[PDB]
Design an enzyme around this catalytic site. Structure first.
Site, mmCIF file in Angstrom:
data_model
loop_
_atom_site.group_PDB
_atom_site.id
_atom_site.type_symbol
_atom_site.label_atom_id
_atom_site.label_comp_id
_atom_site.label_asym_id
_atom_site.label_seq_id
_atom_site.Cartn_x
_atom_site.Cartn_y
_atom_site.Cartn_z
ATOM 1 N NE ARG A 290 20.076 -3.880 0.146
ATOM 2 C CZ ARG A 290 20.095 -3.369 1.375
ATOM 3 N NH1 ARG A 290 19.561 -2.178 1.620
ATOM 4 N NH2 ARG A 290 20.642 -4.058 2.367
ATOM 5 C CB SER A 291 13.789 -8.792 -4.052
ATOM 6 O OG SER A 291 12.905 -8.550 -2.973
ATOM 7 C CG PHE B 139 8.160 -3.093 -7.862
ATOM 8 C CD1 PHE B 139 9.008 -2.092 -7.403
ATOM 9 C CD2 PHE B 139 8.338 -4.390 -7.390
ATOM 10 C CE1 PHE B 139 10.020 -2.375 -6.491
ATOM 11 C CE2 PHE B 139 9.347 -4.686 -6.479
ATOM 12 C CZ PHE B 139 10.190 -3.676 -6.029
ATOM 13 C CB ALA B 140 4.583 -4.358 -3.942
ATOM 14 C CB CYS B 141 1.352 -8.246 -6.424
ATOM 15 S SG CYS B 141 2.146 -8.904 -7.906
ATOM 16 C CB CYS C 98 10.015 -7.487 -18.010
ATOM 17 S SG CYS C 98 9.323 -8.780 -16.964
ATOM 18 C CG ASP D 110 17.384 -5.600 3.266
ATOM 19 O OD1 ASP D 110 17.677 -6.068 4.385
ATOM 20 O OD2 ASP D 110 17.074 -6.315 2.289
ATOM 21 C CB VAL D 111 13.937 -6.293 6.601
ATOM 22 C CG1 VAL D 111 13.409 -6.452 8.020
ATOM 23 C CG2 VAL D 111 12.813 -6.495 5.616
#
Ligand code: NAD
Ligand code: NAD
Lengths: 317, 317
Positions: free
Chosen positions: A183-184, A272-274, A148, A206-207
C-alpha cells in the site's frame, strides 16, 4: 497441472512495434534526432544499476537519446533535476529510487518538471488516477498519463487476458477478486485503486491492517470507496488471498515468502518488488506466473514519454 | 541562575495588532464579512481536538469566519477537501494531522488547493523554501508563504532576539549554532534548511543519522549545502548539542527525554512536538525555554492566510 511462466520481456515485446513507429514520426519532424530521455542514478545498488542499464539499452534500441547522469552525493541529485528541467534538449526525466530511502524521495518526485515526468511520479497524475480524470486541460487535448509501475501491471493483466476485452471501458475487471500486498503511496495504493476502478474488488494488504477497495460510492467525487478491515492477522491474509483470483505483490524484503497455501487454484500471480517475494513452488496453483515487472514497467515509462512529448507539441499553442 | 520560560501565547500576542488591522480592511471591501477559514479534523486525538478548538477561538476572536468540518471516516476527508477547494466562500483550508498516519497524509497535503493552503503544506512552498524563492510570479507580486510550523519557530527566535536584528536579511543568524532533533519532510528538514539559509550552522538529528546543514555551496541552485555526518550515536548527539547554542526538538514520542547534559549554558530551547520531549530540569542551563509552539503556529497560519487572500486579490487580474 503446473502453471506457465511469462517473462516481462515477452509482454514488452507487444509494445515494440507501437513505440518504434511513434518514434520514427518524431524523428522526421525533429530532424533525425529522437527524444532525449535522461536517467538519474543516485544509489549504490547492484539491482538499480542493472535496471538502469536495461532502460538505457531498451530506449536506445527503440531510438531514444538516453543519457544516464549518475550523481555521487545524494543531496546534489536535486540540483541536477532543476537544471535538467530547464534543459530544453531533455525531453524526459526519470529517477532511480531509492535515492535517500525515505520521505525525501517522495519530495524529489515532486521536483521533476511535470511535463517531463515520464514515470508519472508527480502528484497530479496520482490525483487524476484516484479521481478517474482522463485529461488535464478543459478542451480534453492533453491526456493525463498514469504512473508506469501500476500501469504496467494493468497492461500485464491485459496481456494475460484477465481484463475481459469484451466489456465497456472501466469495467473489464467486473467479476474479479484481486489482492495487492503493498500500500505504498507510489505503487500499492494507486494500483489497488486503479484495479477497483475497472470493476474488480481489491484486498489491499499493509503491515498494520488490511482494507477492501471497491468502486466509487459518491456523487461528489468519483473516487474508489475504501472498506476498512481487521488489523493485519496472518490467517486473515490467508482468507483474503484465497478468495482473490489475482494476486500482486511488492514487499521490499529480500527474504519474503508468500505462503503457497494462500494462492487459489488458477490464480494469476504478479510481483513488482525488485526482490523475489514469491515462493518458487507457486507454479502449481497459479494459472500464470510473472516473476517480475521490470521490463514491462520500462515499456510503459517509454510510451508515457511519447505521450508527454506529443502533449508538449499539442500544447505548443 | 534558572532560565526563564516564554509561553507561545505571549509570542503570538505580538502579531495580534497586525493581524486584526489586516482583517478589518478585508471586512470593509468584503461587505462586513471576514475570511472563511475551514478546518478539517479527521483524527480521534484529545490533543488535536484541543488544538482545533484553540485555532477556532483564536481565529473567530480576530474576526475570521472559522468552520470546523469534522469527518468520521478517514477516506472521505479527501472528497471533503475537493468540494472545499471549489467552494468560493472558503478562503482558507487546513487539515489536522495525523489523518491516516503515514504517506497518505503527505498525499492529502498536496490535494489542498494551493491558493487556499494556509499552513503551507503544498509542495510548491517547500521547494521555494529550499531554493530561497521569495515570490511565485515573474513580476514579483505574489509572495510565496512558508509552512507555518518552521516559520513560527523562526518568528519565535526573532522574538527571543536570537535573530540579530542589525544584520542584512538572510544572515541574521550568522555566528550561531542550531540543532534540530527532527528531519520530517513536513517540519524538521525545512526548518533546519530555513535556519541555515539565515546563516546559522544546523545539526539535523534523525533516528538513523546526523547531518550538518550549511549555506548554499552552488551557483546552479541556491540550496543549502548538506554535510553528512556519522551514524546516530547517542554520545555523538551530545557533542553536537553541546556546541549548539540553539536547540529545537520535535520527536513524536510522548516519553522522550533530551538529556539536560546536552544543553549548553545559555542555550535557547524550543519544542514543537505536540508532546513534552524536554526534561523539566532544563530550565537551569537554557537561557530561555519555550515549552511548545502551538499558539505561535496558529498566528503564522493565520497571517499566511491573510497573505494568500491578498494574493488572490492581487492576482484577480
Ligand atoms: N519494479 C519497479 O519498477 C518498482 C517500482 C516501485 C517500487 N518497487 C518495489 O516496491 C518497494 C516499495 O517499498 P517502500 O520503499 O515504499 O517501503 P515501505 O516499507 O515504506 O512500504 C512497503 C509497503 O509494503 C508493505 N509491506 C511491507 N512488509 C509487508 C509485509 N510483511 N506484509 C504485508 N505488507 C507489507 C508496507 O506496509 C507498505 O505498504 C520497493 O523497495 C521496490 O522493491 C519496484
Ligand atoms: N506543533 C505543531 O503544529 C506540529 C506540526 C507538525 C508536526 N508536529 C510534531 O512532529 C511530529 C512529526 O513526526 P512524524 O509523524 O513525521 O513521524 P516520523 O517518526 O516519521 O518522523 C519523526 C522525525 O523525528 C525523528 N525522530 C524520531 N525519534 C527520534 C529519536 N529518538 N531521536 C532523534 N530523532 C528522532 C525521526 O527520524 C524523523 O525524522 C508529529 O507527531 C507532531 O508531534 C507538531
Amino acid at each position: 497441472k503446473p502453471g506457465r511462466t511469462i517473462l516481462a520481456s515477452k509482454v514488452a515485446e507487444t509494445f515494440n512495434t507501437e513505440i518504434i513507429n511513434n518514434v520514427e514520426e518524431y524523428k522526421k519532424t525533429h530532424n533525425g534526432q529522437g527524444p532525449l530521455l535522461v536517467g538519474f542514478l543516485a544509489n549504490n545498488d547492484p539491482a538499480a544499476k542493472m535496471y538502469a542499464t536495461w532502460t538505457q539499452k531498451t530506449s536506445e534500441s527503440m531510438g531514444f537519446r538516453y543519457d544516464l547522469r549518475v550523481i555521487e552525493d545524494k543531496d546534489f541529485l536535486e540540483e541536477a533535476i532543476i537544471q535538467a528541467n530547464g534543459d530544453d534538449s531533455v525531453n524526459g526525466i526519470m529517477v532511480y529510487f531509492p535515492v535517500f530511502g525515505n520521505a525525501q524521495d517522495q519530495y524529489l518526485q515532486q521536483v521533476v518538471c511535470k511535463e517531463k515526468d515520464v514515470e508519472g511520479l508527480n502528484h497530479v497524475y496520482y490525483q487524476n488516477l484516484y479521481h478517474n480524470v482522463r485529461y488535464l486541460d478543459k478542451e480534453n487535448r492533453l491526456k493525463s498519463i498514469l504512473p508506469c509501475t501500476p500501469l504496467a501491471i494493468v497492461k500485464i493483466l491485459e496481456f494475460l487476458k484477465i481484463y475481459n476485452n469484451l466489456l465497456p471501458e472501466g469495467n473489464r475487471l467486473y467479476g474479479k477478486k484481486c489482492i495487492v500486498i503493498n500500500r505504498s503511496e507510489i505503487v500499492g495504493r494507486p494500483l489497488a485503486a486503479l484495479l477497483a476502478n475497472d470493476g474488480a474488488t481489491v484486498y489491499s494488504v499493509d503491515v498494520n491492517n488490511i482494507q477492501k477497495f471497491t468502486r466509487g460510492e459518491s456523487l461528489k467525487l468519483n473516487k474508489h470507496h475504501v472498506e476498512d478491515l481487521g488489523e493485519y492477522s496472518e490467517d486473515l491474509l490467508k482468507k483474503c488471498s484465497l478468495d482473490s483470483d489475482v494476486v500482486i505483490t511488492g514487499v521490499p524484503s529480500e527474504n519474503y515468502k508468500f505462503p503457497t497455501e494462500y494462492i487459489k487454484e488458477g490464480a494469476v500471480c504478479i510481483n513488482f518488488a525488485c526482490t523475489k517475494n514469491f515462493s518458487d513452488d507457486v507454479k502449481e496453483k497459479a494459472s500464470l506466473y510473472v516473476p517480475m515487472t521490470g521490463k514491462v514497467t520500462i515499456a510503459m515509462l517509454l510510451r508515457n514519454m511519447l505521450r508527454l512529448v506529443r502533449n508538449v507539441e499539442l500544447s505548443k499553442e
